[PDB]
Symmetry: C2
């Protein structure tokens, strides 16, 4: 409704913080508001299962 | 010696080509000469071995 970025984006868009050296997903809706650098960490959704010990 | 970029970089640095929609590794020595976009393809060195041919 109010279209207010909260969080670390709200500290960069609204001038509160100077830079965010933090784990932040580069999205398109966050691309237009702040300048991301290149991705330092390629990642994605992974499958956490229990390691097996069963019998 | 002559510090001349060949290849597709030499077509972008020396104005011959307009854009390179091509598989090109984003390196630092290529970052300073041309503007890369964000990486569309996370990749790296992989281990190609023969499939087990248990016959």
């Amino acid at each position: 409704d109010t279209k207010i970025w909260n969080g670390m984006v709200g500290e960069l868009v609204y001038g509160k913080a100077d830079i965010a050296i933090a784990p932040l997903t580069i999205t398109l809706v966050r691309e237009e508001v702040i300048d991301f650098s290149k991705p330092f960490m390629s990642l994605g959704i992974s499958i956490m299962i229990k390691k097996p010990q069963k019998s």
